[PDB]
């Protein structure tokens, strides 16, 4: 079960499109105690984004069915099944972040990466929260994005793709979770402009396409 065996079976799992497998591999890597290379870090992030992405999509389908009888009670119970799966996944990632990843990130860029992940999975918890439970989730997401944001401003170029990805997801958080288009647009626009002023290689396609991404959201929000 060596780190690099697991990394290789993880890469195989990705090519096979068996993402629960890939995530279990990368989880094992992470629990081994040591800081994650950029390779590992990215494999982890990809695995869990696909694992959770499937539940997010399924959840959406069944919610929008439930909003359109005993069939309606079927949709409700099934949605709660998917919800419990999704919640269990999210909290798995968040435990990994608090226990291994964030307290081990010596690269400041990784510290931003992990806080942004934390923002993201509290965001996914918030997409499906229902109650007085939801404020605390929303606060955890927003606070984690704000921490990531803050650090990225000191340690990162406005053109850096992790800084811009952090900006995109933060702005989406404001739009979808806080229903606040003004903050969403402000954050997005400030980041696009501080980027388009400093373009002056090899991660270029990343920045620009995230920039394109930022632009697109602006267009649909204004």
């Amino acid at each position: 079960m060596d780190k690099n065996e697991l990394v290789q079976k993880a890469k195989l799992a990705e090519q096979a499109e068996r993402y629960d497998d890939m995530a279990a591999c990368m989880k094992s890597v992470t629990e081994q105690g040591a800081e994650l290379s950029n390779e590992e870090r990215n494999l982890l992030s990809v695995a869990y984004k696909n694992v959770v992405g499937a539940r997010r999509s399924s959840w959406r389908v069944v919610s929008s069915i439930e909003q359109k009888e005993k069939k309606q009670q079927m949709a409700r119970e099934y949605r709660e099944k998917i919800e419990t799966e999704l919640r269990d996944i999210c909290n798995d990632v968040l435990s990994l972040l608090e226990k291994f990843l964030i307290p081990n990130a010596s690269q400041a860029e990784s510290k931003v990466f992990y806080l942004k992940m934390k923002g993201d999975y509290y965001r996914y918890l918030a997409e499906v929260a229902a109650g007085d439970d939801k404020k605390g989730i929303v606060d955890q997401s927003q606070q984690a994005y704000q921490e990531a944001f803050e650090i990225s401003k000191k340690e990162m170029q406005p053109t850096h793709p992790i800084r811009l990805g952090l900006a995109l997801n933060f702005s989406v958080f404001y739009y979808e979770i806080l229903n606040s288009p003004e903050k969403a647009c402000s954050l997005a626009k400030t980041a696009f402009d501080e980027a388009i002023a400093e373009l002056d290689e090899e991660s270029y396609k990343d920045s620009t396409l995230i920039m394109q991404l930022l632009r697109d959201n602006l267009t649909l929000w204004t």
């Binding site: 992030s45 990809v46 984004k49 993201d120 990805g165 995109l168 997801n169 989406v172 739009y175 979808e176 995230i210 991404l213 697109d216 959201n217 649909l220």
Partner: peptide
């Protein structure tokens, strides 16, 4: 599309 960063 979705509005968030797509991390393949």
């Amino acid at each position: 599309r979705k509005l968030s960063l797509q991390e393949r």
